[PDB]
Amino acid sequence: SQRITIDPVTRIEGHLRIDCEIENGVVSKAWASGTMWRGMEEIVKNRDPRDAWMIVQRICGVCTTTHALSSVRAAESALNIDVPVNAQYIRNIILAAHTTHDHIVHFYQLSALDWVDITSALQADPTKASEMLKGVSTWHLNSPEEFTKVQNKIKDLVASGQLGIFANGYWGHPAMKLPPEVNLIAVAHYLQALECQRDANRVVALLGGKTPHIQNLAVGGVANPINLDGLGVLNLERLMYIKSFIDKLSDFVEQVYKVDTAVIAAFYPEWLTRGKGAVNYLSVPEFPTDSKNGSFLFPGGYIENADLSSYRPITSHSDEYLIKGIQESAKHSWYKDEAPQAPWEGTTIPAYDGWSDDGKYSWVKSPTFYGKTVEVGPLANMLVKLAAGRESTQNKLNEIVAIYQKLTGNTLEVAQLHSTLGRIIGRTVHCCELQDILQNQYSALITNIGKGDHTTFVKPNIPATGEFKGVGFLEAPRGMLSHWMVIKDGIISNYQAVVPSTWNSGPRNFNDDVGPYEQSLVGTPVADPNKPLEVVRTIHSFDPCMACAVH
C-alpha cells in the first residue's frame, strides 16, 4: 500500500491531521488526529459553577453560543433550576440564528471549493448559467449580470497573480465534475452567502450582546432585561430590530442554499454511495418551550443499525437511558486513563508519547453509547426526525429531492442518505427548518411579553457542602453536545465536555472499533495520492471542529 498524510486539513475549524493507507488507489485504512489541546476542562475546574459558561464558551468560536448554553444547562441540571420561558425563547433564537450562520458558512466558505473549480468558472457563459436555474430557483440574484460581475472579480484576482485563498486549489482535478456554468453559479452564491450569514449573526448580536462569544446567559436564565417601555433595555424597538434581521434569512436559505445542495448532489451522484461513517445515530431534542426545560420543538432519538422503524425516541434532557449510555475511552488517545469512563467520573490526564499507528495518535477521546460507535450531527438529526415522522422534515427533504429529480430524472431513497452527500443534505434541511424555529420563537416571545410576563432570571443557590452532578444537552450544528459538571462544596470538582466532533472524529476506541471519520474513508477512491481531494470531501461533510473535538 501507499501511506499519505493530510496535515493540515484546511477549511475546518482547528487542527486536524488525516492519514490514509491506500491500496491500488482506494483508501483501505484511515487515522484521524486532533493535534492541538488546551485542557479547557481542567481550566474551568475549581471555580464557581456560575463562571463556567463564560470560560467554556471559548472551547470554540465557530460554534460560538453552543458551549455557553450547554454549560448553563449543566449547572441548572445539577442545581435543579427550571429556566423561565422567556429565557428559553431568547436562548432558542440565539441558537437557531447562530446555527443558520454556521451551516451557510460550512456549505460555502468551508466546503464548496471541494466541489467547485474556479478556473472552470472563468470559462462559463453567464447567460447560459442563469438560464440553467429557470424554474429551479426564484432567487433574485441569479441574473447574467450578477454572474458576469462575479466572473470578472475572479478573473481580476487570477490576473493579479495573487490568488490568496484560491492559490494551489484543486483546479482541473479529475474529481471536479461541474460544468463551467455551475462552477460560476456556486462562486456567485459563495459571495452572496456572506451577506446572509452576517444577517443571521445580527440576530445573535442583538440578544447576545455581541458575536462571536455571546454574553447574555446566566445559570438561571438570561441577562436581557425585558421591558417594552424601558430606555436602554430589551424593549419593543429592539425586538422589532431583531425581527427585521430574522426576516432577511429565509430567501437565501430556501432559494440558494437549499437549491445548490440539490444541484451539487445532481452532478456528484457517486457521493451518495460512499462516506458512510456509522450504523448508529444519536440526536437530542432541542428548542425547549415550556417552563420546566422541556417541550422541545425538534425531536431527538437513537437509531441502531440504520433501522429508523425501531428507533428509540428521546424527549427529555433528563433521559436516564441517554445519560447512562455515554462513555469515553482514551486507549488510542494521548491521555493516561484508557478504560471507558462515564463523564461525571471522567479524567483528562495528558500522556503524549508521539504518534503510533496501533497505539495513541490523537488528542480526541473515543465516545461510545452503550459500547457502540455513533455518528452525531445533521445526518443523525435528519434521520431521527424522519424516524419520528416529522412532516416538516420529510417535506423539506422532498423539496431537495424534487430539484434533484428534475435535474437527474432520479429520486433519492433513505438508504442513499447514509453517505457524504446525505450528510450535507441533512445539514441543509436543518438550516431550512431553523427558519421556522426563529419565526415561532420570536412570535412566542412577543406573545408572552404581551401577557405580562417579563421574567428572565431565577437566582440560584449553591449549597456550600455536598456533592451533586448535572448534565446539559444541546443539539449543536455538528450534533449532540453534552457538558457534565460535578459540584463539591460549592465549586466545580469535575467538568467534562463530550462534544459532537469528539463522537465523529475520535480515534479507535477501547475495543479498537473505528469511529465515523475513519470508517467513512474506507473505500474512498484517490485519483492522485499527492492531492487527495476525495478524502477531504468526505471529511468536510462532517463539518469538523477540532477545538470542539479536543478542548
Partner: protein, 268 residues
C-alpha cells in the same frame, strides 16, 4: 494593482478571532480578501490543504519576505517542548518563529495571543504564553479581546497600508484608538454608578431600567477597550453592558478568565 500580503497562523485558537472578520462591514471579509489584502495563508478559508498549503506558505514567505503582516490568534504552548500544538509534524512555535523572521509587522489578534487569555488561565495545562513572549526581539502589536471587534484589527492593518506605519500604541503595544481608555471612563451607565442606581440581580427593577451593572461584577473599571463606544456588529447599541450583562474583563490580563463574573472590580 498588487495588494499587501498577510500570513495568518493559528496556534491554540478557538477560531473566534477569525470569525470576527465574518461580522465586519468596513471592510467586509469578501472585500478584505479580494480588495484590501492578499491573504496568502489562512487555513480556515484556503482551497489548498496539506502539502499544497504548506507549499503556499513557503512560497509566500519567500516572495513577500520583508513585506507581509503576520497575524497570530491563540496562545502558544511551551510545555513539553511544544507538542500541545503540532502542525505538519512540528510545534506551532517553530512555524511562528520562522514566519516572524520575514514579517514587516506582527499582530497578536485576541487575548490568547496578546497575553495568554483563557488558554493560559487557571493551572495553565499546556504552558500557554503570548506571542510577544515567544518573539522577544520583535514589537508585537496587541489587539486584545475575546474576540476584539474586528475593526480594531482591520483599522490597524489599514493604518499600516495607508500611512506606512502602525497606529499609535500604548505601553502594552495596544492601538490607542481602540484601547486607550477604561470602559468605565467612557460608559453611558456612569450617571447611574454616580447616583448609586445599581442592578442587584438580573431581572430586578433597576436592571430593567438600564442601571449600572457594577454590583453584578462589571469589570469596566479595570478594563481598557472601546466596547462602550465602537460596540459590536455595527447595528447600533450592542455591547454586553447595553444588553444587560456586566463586562467580564475579557480584554484585560488578570481580569477576564481570572476574576469571577460576579466578583467586584477595583475602582480607581
Amino acid at each position: 494593482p498588487q495588494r499587501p500580503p498577510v500570513i495568518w497562523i493559528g496556534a491554540q485558537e478557538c477560531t473566534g478571532c477569525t470569525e470576527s472578520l465574518l461580522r465586519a462591514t468596513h471592510p467586509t471579509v469578501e472585500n478584505l480578501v479580494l480588495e484590501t489584502i492578499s491573504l496568502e495563508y489562512h487555513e480556515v478559508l484556503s482551497a489548498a490543504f496539506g502539502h499544497q498549503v504548506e507549499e503556499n506558505k513557503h512560497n509566500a514567505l519567500e516572495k513577500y519576505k520583508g513585506q507581509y503582516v503576520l497575524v497570530v490568534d491563540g496562545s502558544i504552548p511551551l510545555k513539553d517542548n511544544g507538542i500541545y500544538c503540532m502542525v505538519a509534524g512540528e510545534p506551532i512555535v517553530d512555524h511562528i518563529r520562522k514566519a516572524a523572521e520575514g514579517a514587516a509587522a506582527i499582530i497578536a489578534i485576541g487575548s490568547c495571543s496578546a497575553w495568554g487569555g483563557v488558554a493560559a488561565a487557571g493551572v495553565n495545562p499546556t504552558g500557554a504564553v503570548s506571542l510577544q513572549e515567544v518573539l522577544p526581539g520583535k514589537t508585537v502589536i496587541n489587539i486584545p479581546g475575546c474576540p476584539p471587534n474586528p475593526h480594531n484589527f482591520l483599522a490597524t492593518v489599514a493604518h499600516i497600508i495607508t500611512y506606512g506605519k502602525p497606529p499609535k500604541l500604548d505601553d502594552k503595544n495596544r492601538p490607542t484608538f481602540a484601547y486607550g481608555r477604561l470602559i468605565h471612563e467612557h460608559c453611558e451607565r456612569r450617571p447611574h454608578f454616580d447616583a448609586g442606581r445599581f442592578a442587584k440581580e438580573f431581572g430586578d427593577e433597576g436592571h430593567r431600567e438600564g442601571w449600572c451593572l457594577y454590583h453584578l461584577g462589571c469589570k469596566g473599571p479595570e478594563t481598557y477597550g472601546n466596547c462602550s463606544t465602537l460596540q459590536f456588529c455595527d447595528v447600533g447599541g450592542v455591547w454586553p453592558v447595553a444588553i444587560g450583562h456586566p463586562c467580564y474583563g475579557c480584554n484585560e490580563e488578570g481580569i477576564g478568565f481570572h476574576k469571577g463574573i460576579h466578583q467586584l472590580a477595583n475602582v480607581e
